[PDB]
Amino acid sequence: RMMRWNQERRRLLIEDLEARIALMPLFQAEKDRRTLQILRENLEEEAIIMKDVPNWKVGESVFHTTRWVPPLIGEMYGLRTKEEMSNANFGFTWYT
Amino acid sequence: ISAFLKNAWAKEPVLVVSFSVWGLAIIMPMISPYTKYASMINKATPYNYPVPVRDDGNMPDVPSHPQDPLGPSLDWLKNL
Amino acid sequence: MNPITLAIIYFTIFLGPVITMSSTNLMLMWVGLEFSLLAIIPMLINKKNPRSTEAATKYFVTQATASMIILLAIVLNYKQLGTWMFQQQTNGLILNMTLMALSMKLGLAPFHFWLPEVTQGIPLHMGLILLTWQKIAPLSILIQIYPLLNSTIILMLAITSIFMGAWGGLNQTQMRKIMAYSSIAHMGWMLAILPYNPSLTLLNLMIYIILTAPMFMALMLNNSMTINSISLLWNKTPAMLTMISLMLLSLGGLPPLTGFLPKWIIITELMKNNCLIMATLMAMMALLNLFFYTRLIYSTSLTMFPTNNNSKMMTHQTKTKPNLMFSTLAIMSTMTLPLAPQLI
Amino acid sequence: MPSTFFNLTMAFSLSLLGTLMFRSHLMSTLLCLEGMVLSLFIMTSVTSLNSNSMSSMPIPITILVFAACEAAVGLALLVKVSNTYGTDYVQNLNLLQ
Amino acid sequence: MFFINILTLLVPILIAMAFLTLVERKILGYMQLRKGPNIVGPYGILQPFADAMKLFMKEPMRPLTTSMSLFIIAPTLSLTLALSLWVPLPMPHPLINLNLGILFILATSSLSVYSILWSGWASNSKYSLFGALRAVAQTISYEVTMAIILLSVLLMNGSYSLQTLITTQEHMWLLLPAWPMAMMWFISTLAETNRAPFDLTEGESELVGFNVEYAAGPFALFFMAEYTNIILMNALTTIIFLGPLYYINLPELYSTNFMMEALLLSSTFLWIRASYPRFRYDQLMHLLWKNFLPLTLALCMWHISLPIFTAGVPPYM
Amino acid sequence: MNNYIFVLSSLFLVGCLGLALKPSPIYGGLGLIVSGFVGCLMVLGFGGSFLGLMVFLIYLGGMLVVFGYTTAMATEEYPGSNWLILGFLVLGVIMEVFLICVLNYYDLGDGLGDWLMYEVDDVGVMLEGGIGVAAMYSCATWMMVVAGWSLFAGIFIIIEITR
Amino acid sequence: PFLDIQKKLGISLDRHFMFLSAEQPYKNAARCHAFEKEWIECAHGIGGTRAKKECKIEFDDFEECLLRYKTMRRMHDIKKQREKLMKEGKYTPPPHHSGREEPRP
Amino acid sequence: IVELPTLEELKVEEVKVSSAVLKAAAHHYGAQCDKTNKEFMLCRWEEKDPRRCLKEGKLVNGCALNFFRQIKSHCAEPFTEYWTCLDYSNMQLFRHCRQQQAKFDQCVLDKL
Amino acid sequence: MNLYTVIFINILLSLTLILVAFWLPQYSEKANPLPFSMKFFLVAITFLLFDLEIALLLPLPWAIQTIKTSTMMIMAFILVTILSLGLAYEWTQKGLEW
Amino acid sequence: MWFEILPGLAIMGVCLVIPGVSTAYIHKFTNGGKEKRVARVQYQWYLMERDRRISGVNRYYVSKGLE
């Protein structure tokens, strides 16, 4: 009865994981355009304001590749509310 | 030898079991009809996303759609 | 020792250096070093005499802290380069740590205090292993990383060792410690050429092994830990007096014997690289090493020390023979010089 | 992390200064020695964790497994010493002079 | 209302423990043909308040202890952990959800050993030091048999989450797959409380153990923490081996049936105290090192195969 | 807070400074058991539930406990008042503050910002330590074998030393 | 290494996991998997002495994918600037700081 | 300046429905709206940059809302009873809402 | 957090109960109240060399779900066995014996 | 007789179900009438957070599809 049952928990997981397969496109699309909306919106707050003294170039990627550096948690929410930094940096460890 | 096991089963009736199940578990996998599936039921789980390959027309098997008759169809895991 | 234990230990003392040499993932090189530390300690206390426990407890603490420092270098590298292994980019301090640490396990220079003392409290046999099959491991790690280590430090540890080894040896009369001191010295030459031509380190080691292994099996044939003890060699076993004479002068650099080649080519390589400052001072005090070697020569061969009456009793009884290795390693060592070109 | 990684490193150096400056009891040393292994274990685990380098997590533990036995050997030497002298003071370990 | 949860999580276990002091005196009594407390309350329901409100008023004599720092940190460590191993307990709804839950329960359980070590060492006495060294030997030796039983079993529910054990048991109790584990678990939960046929420490006839020099409060806490994890290590058996009903609706039934089986396993320990002469310190070990540990290691090897050959590898999550 | 780790890091140094002043053999064991608790916490901070708990399970109660154990058996002769040490320790408590202070004014800095959990998949599973430690059985099965021999020949090394 | 009993025997017990770009479990690429590749397919066939000068672009980048310090200096500087201006009110917490601004999926 | 698309550009009608309903209508969202979602991935894994496939992203955010829009007209009430029980759980298991599943599947086997 | 709150509350309760214990009460020689257990030390490092054993056996829960299941099985069995043979040697050595 | 040990258990029999029923209703009342969702793996959190973003600041609140 532990043979025949744990097999089923597997088949329920496949049912439960393939659901997750169908929704990677929607989430990865939202996640791309969201984080790609944070740092134009943070590029602004850095450029629109906060930067009128000399020798500063807004959006000075520090790498040379020009490939897409997946933004770091810090750069993504850091200059934003103290709450956001934790909710991104300690939201899961703190539970559920 | 066979009657030495008889006192070792009367007195010391523990190590017998511990060297009778230590081993039993080494032979059950090598001789079972269903041991093949453990590396397969554990191979089917799509934990990460299956990246689709670009079409060239040179790939007949690759099932074009999730519901095509083609591809890894597990009517096995069902009623395994 | 339950022969099973003997096997497990000996296997570890032998798997220890071999894992170090074979692996490239430094981590696996560290555990190779760690095993060697664990395997050697049981053998060191085999007599379990009060001197022995002291020996092992020192050897272990010296070995353990160095092992921890080597691990720290690997841990630091992991954060300066994701790799688990030293690379061109490695921070200089990261490598220097590895030099100091590894120079402690090998016991070179200002960390040369543990070796003479552990060589004094362990048996002649385990003395050999502690001196020669435990130097292979750390040296491997250094030889692998030679392109990256500092020429300055190595040289300082090299020169220091040569001096400490020589000076220490002059005063010592206990043989085990005379050898411990020699090993410090030879170990010094070896680490001098590492930055320039590692391949010569591997010659200055083998020759040291082919010289020291016969020398110790000689000391134990009569199990003499005293020069006075080796001096009565003429009565206990007269034949080994001839080769003991040449091997010890070979250990020092005198020209006809095999021992000159390691010093000669190391000097040739250092002059090729322009260290004619360093090489000169090393060769000069290297000459101090021969003085204490010849002082022993005097006592054991060139002059016959007086013996006790009971020595006649030990002559009567058949002397258990010296293994064949003695011969094959005495000759290949005392006289191969005519074949130097192919050795290098 | 860069900030913290410093604290752990100095912890290892403070533990380094400890094991290289004995005082009476040896068990103190061995204990200190262990303080390093903890600092190394913590640092290895920390960087592996923020490099998302899961292929390397095996190491943080291999470090502990080898370090534990290493310490086992160390303590057996210690017990051997306070069986031959019964006071475990680094002070009496000087016969080899 | 998270604080409402702790207040309704620690009050209803310090108020339960208290009436285990009572129930450990009556059930033992009627087996001894002797009524327990009947007088201070209706049927002894009001006796623990007396010696609660009494022990705390007796002089906490720091008897020339080597170090108070320990004398007063050991007893607090205990009740601190014991009342913490309840935080991740897998009720139909656990106070806190902790993947690695079962490890948490294992780890915290271990720290307890210190209380024995520290208390014994601080209070300068032969008995104290003697008992401690001997006692922890037992405790530690039994961790190695608990862990494996703990590990082995895991392969079956397939995760370290207490909260999944309930699902794994959605249709059966794990007592039937693993009664060998559950036997040795029972002794590893009955002898890791320094309790029962196994009370070597606090050997009373032979040793007067560590808590000997403790009195009044410092004692009460040590005690309170032996009866607040006399209910844990039975509460786990009512989770890991005896699986009560769990329905998305009616989420109490589980707690109710959790009750019915935890009291038996908490009332099953009480038959033991009143039934078995104590094991001698040598025998206890030989029970674990030369009998249980072998069977435990082999059966662990058996359980790693069972999934593979039965293809029953449990679902992560 | 954001200085969730720093503070802890600072506590880890304090515990190491305590072990470094070499306090009485068992009073300092506590010290280790303290910083081991502290190091257990930091790793948890970064998401290493397994790796973290592991330390709290093995070094904390396994190694350390056995350590003091032996202290009691020997080298707990409990013959400088640790209080003197605590006095010095207090000095270091703030002396380290001095070391940090210079770099404090120099200033990363201002506590701890996003200098933890650099990159984490905002979607996805199987991302969790213990999946990496379980590479001992797939793709890193040599670390597992050599650890075995350590412990295995450890038995034989210990008994031989003991005997 | 010193004695390559591994290449000879063909076994790979110690090489499969030496760099961050090695096979990570469940194909979970680590941070920088992009760079280290670019910095070791570059230095392949070119020895170190010449993996240290011309293949310096890829290490200078990989030294900042992982240390990620030049970033700090940028961000830390930015931080200070905000502080000074803000103190004189020259700069105001952005709408982002004010929250809202339509936090979206 | 590193290219960072204009916020205006990023604007797209969005799904804005809680995870529970997505988990209910997911297996049908894999059947339908697949050609429009896999091509996003096929750009996403080939072209490793979220600043280039935003094209197909707006398509994914489009076909999905299409999927539901039909379900909202067609067979909405039995869909509401389905996820309304499924979201009651703590991990949203199909294992419980198994009767609500066929009642929604037969309603959607016939229609659409 | 919650876990912090709880564990911290659990401490405060412990401390209070000893606070009240040493204060509620508010001389006489009332206060007035060894060889090595080599066996014990052995038992102790036997436990160290075994606790680390568990630490290398805890991955099983997450390795059972590895593709190379056949490999895991093999790797595990050896560990459990080599450790049993160690215990067994101890048995013969009589180290286990008290 | 033995009738009397029951008064005692009765309290340890409610003192032990007060916790299991309590924790399992202070969850269904501090999570909007629905079990407290369990975030065991990154993907569960994301979904949970996403929900908060979709409606109110509370995960618990849910958008039926009219949103």
Ligand SMILES: CCCCCCCCCCCCCCCCCC(=O)OC[C@H](COP(=O)(O)OCCN)OC(=O)CCCCCCCCCCCCCCCCC
């Ligand atoms: C490049 C030249 C280097 C130098 C070469 C010349 C020196 C050789 C080394 C000599 C070193 C030892 C000097 C002192 C020896 C003392 C020997 C002695 O005391 O006699 C006893 C000894 C053993 O006795 P046993 O053979 O058992 O029987 C007699 C028992 N009373 O009796 C014996 O040992 C007998 C055997 C002695 C060894 C014979 C060696 C003969 C000389 C070798 C010369 C080689 C020249 C090579 C030239 C190369 C040119 C390119």
